Design a protein around this ligand. Structure first.
Ligand SMILES: Cc1cc2nc3c(=O)[nH]c(=O)nc-3n(C[C@H](O)[C@H](O)[C@H](O)COP(=O)(O)O)c2cc1C
Ligand SMILES: Cc1cc2nc3c(=O)[nH]c(=O)nc-3n(C[C@H](O)[C@H](O)[C@H](O)COP(=O)(O)O)c2cc1C
Lengths: 191, 191
């Protein structure tokens, strides 16, 4: 089928892209080299202007890139990207310069940012690091302002997710352990 | 049916209780008064010893209790607790001393802690605040060590979730906005 239709997400609603707690892909660029890893420990931090947290282990090449550039992208992978997600979270760029081609990661650029975005995801958030030395050293905890947000309109539009009507393979992934994840499920509305 | 069977969760696996990013209930006690609120912005922070983050707005009575006592419980509500979850997140104890009875919250105590635990949840994590003045003031961001963890063995046992085999109403809730949540869904295993 046709290319996914990407639309901007009003910045004040960007937090909704992560509210259900999906496992994400973290991408970054440093000195012209791109990288992508998996992160379960990424959480919204504020609404307006949007902010988020992400925990990045000291062993990761992606953390190094973020420390050097101060910018990254958080993006929401799909069930179709199950293998990609696990692979980028099981291999380090430090061990193979061809990580991205090995993991099946296709990158693109968007909105004049000097950043890599992962093709096939449901949503993307461009992030500017707010440096916090103590948090980063003591807790591996990084805070960023979300400066731009976009999503595939078949699965997120007008400020809401539509997993129930979108193709099943666009559901978000929610990691537990090993190679095991849960896809997001059924919609419920409180009275 | 029978009472849920509660077992301790090995502390080194406690992070798995939150890995899929559920919306949680935050409970706390101060000067003998208990409170419960809803928090979507709660995320694992470390594995061993376990730690977590939670974002608590300055307007919340629960935040006050946490600041005063330095202790709280993070617990994972179920689809059966859809109304309870939305209600405790839509009403403040500051406005009605009877919040808990209004919201249908049944509390219990566990493992000699001076803490309130919410009956009917799938999992509970006892937390000790690690005070971080700047994070708490600037970002409403609270860090805690997880000192104890337990779960309903029908839905989490031997370090793994079993949503696929447990009753559907024990699935976790993943908030988006308004009264709308998604339940956790189908299990997937990477190759
Ligand atoms: C599903 C999944 C979730 C993960 N979550 C995190 C996380 O939240 N933080 C982190 O530092 N590493 C996490 N990891 C591990 C990194 O993705 C992994 O170490 C990766 O190989 C780092 O790649 P890099 O060194 O090329 O940056 C996760 C891995 C997987 C498979
Ligand atoms: C589903 C849901 C998720 C929520 N997430 C958060 C959160 O992460 N942090 C926060 O401070 N408030 C959050 N809220 C709002 C609080 O739960 C709400 O302000 C509550 O009434 C506070 O109660 P209290 O003042 O009695 O402590 C959420 C509400 C709902 C319904």
């Amino acid at each position: 089928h046709v290319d996914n239709n990407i639309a901007a997400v009003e910045l004040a609603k960007a937090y909704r892209l992560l509210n259900h707690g999906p496992t994400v892909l973290v991408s970054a660029r440093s000195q012209g080299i791109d990288n992508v890893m998996a992160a379960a420990w990424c959480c919204a931090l504020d609404f307006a202007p949007p902010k988020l947290t992400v925990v990045l282990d000291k062993m990761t090449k992606t953390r190094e890139f973020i420390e050097q550039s101060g910018m990254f992208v958080i993006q929401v992978p799909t069930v179709a990207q199950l293998q990609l997600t696990h692979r980028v979270g099981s291999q380090s760029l430090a061990d193979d310069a061809n990580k991205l081609l090995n993991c099946g990661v296709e990158l693109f650029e968007m909105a004049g940012h000097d950043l890599p975005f992962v093709a096939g995801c449901s949503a993307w958030l461009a992030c500017k690091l707010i440096p916090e030395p103590n948090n980063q050293l003591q807790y591996d905890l990084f805070i960023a302002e979300v400066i731009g947000a976009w999503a595939d309109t078949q699965v997120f539009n007008h400020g809401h997710w539509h997993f129930d009507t979108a193709p099943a393979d666009k559901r978000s992934l929610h990691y537990i352990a090993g190679g095991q994840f849960y896809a997001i499920g059924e919609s419920f509305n409180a009275d």
